Amino acid sequence: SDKLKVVATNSIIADMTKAIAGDKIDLHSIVPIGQDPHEYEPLPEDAEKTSNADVIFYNGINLEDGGQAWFTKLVKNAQKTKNKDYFAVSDGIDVIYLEGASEKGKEDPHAWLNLENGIIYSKNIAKQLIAKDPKNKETYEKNLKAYVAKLEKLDKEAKSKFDAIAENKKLIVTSEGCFKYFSKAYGVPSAYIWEINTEEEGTPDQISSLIEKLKVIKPSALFVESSVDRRPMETVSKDSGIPIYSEIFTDSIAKKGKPGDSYYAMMKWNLDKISEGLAK
Ligand SMILES: [Fe+3]
């Protein structure tokens, strides 16, 4: 029973962790592939794994950790301590808030869509793996170094990826307003149906607001995330006449064995599909 026991809240963080740790650790990821990680009801296995974990990684910044959110209840019930047992892998990023907001609690969580934040998350993960499992420091550091270099290369690709697309075609449209960090990092504005995942997601007024916007700046493609109900964007597509070009990966990686089945793979998929769809 000597491997470090690690719990990650979702498949993106779990995949980054795997990239650093390989088979050195026993890793459990809570939110199933393709499920919303903002609001999830942990299963009996999840609570057991969390209680028995040596280290727990979560996104923070208002993904799963609001005062009434699922992860907060989870670690509370598991009697765990912040920055001893559980660590927000977003610590250190430049935080972007939900529109019009600036206060703690109203962060936009979707930082990993800027690859430079994926690097910060990875560095944070490696920092705690080394702190808690020093015997494997060599492996963690070696894997971190290779992984950061690979993410850096994709980041450079992302910075050029949309250069051939006319400014009046550059709008990424997704269901959730989850692209703020990508839009900032890579110079492609984004629009959405609802601003962050919550309990209602897809009022007629939200759909109408998006449809109206799509008349002013009219992209050649819409996109749909792998982790949301598609029906609202299908309505948007029907009403605008703009096709859904591809599924993309925002709040989850793809299922294992399918394209996009890692953080690196899902971001490469997004860059390819989004640039290809918008260039039509
Ligand atoms: Fe989200």
Swiss-Prot record:
Pfam families: ZnuA
Keyword set, alphabetical order: Cell membrane, Ion transport, Iron, Iron transport, Lipoprotein, Membrane, Metal-binding, Palmitate, Signal, Transport
Any one annotated GO CC term: plasma membrane
Membrane disposition: Lipid-anchor
One MF term in the entry's GO annotations: metal ion binding
Impact when changing D251A: 18-fold decrease in affinity for Fe(2+). 100-fold decrease in affinity for Fe(2+)
Subcellular location: Cell membrane
One of the GO BP terms on file: iron ion transport
Residues engaged in binding Fe(2+): H38, H110, E176, D251
InterPro entries, alphabetized: AdhesinB, Bact_metal-bind_prot9, Lipoprotein_PsaA-like, ZnuA-like
Gene3D superfamilies: Nitrogenase molybdenum iron protein domain
NCBIfam families: ABC_lipo_SloC
Role noted for this protein: Part of the ATP-binding cassette (ABC) transport system MtsABC involved in iron import. Binds iron with high affinity and specificity and delivers it to the membrane permease for translocation into the cytoplasm. Has low affinity for Zn(2+) and Cu(2+).
Family label: Belongs to the bacterial solute-binding protein 9 family. Lipoprotein receptor antigen (Lrai) subfamily.
Protein's name according to its UniProt entry: Iron ABC transporter substrate-binding lipoprotein MtsA
Organism for this UniProt entry: Streptococcus pyogenes serotype M1
Lineage of source species: Bacteria, Bacillati, Bacillota, Bacilli, Lactobacillales
Gene: mtsA
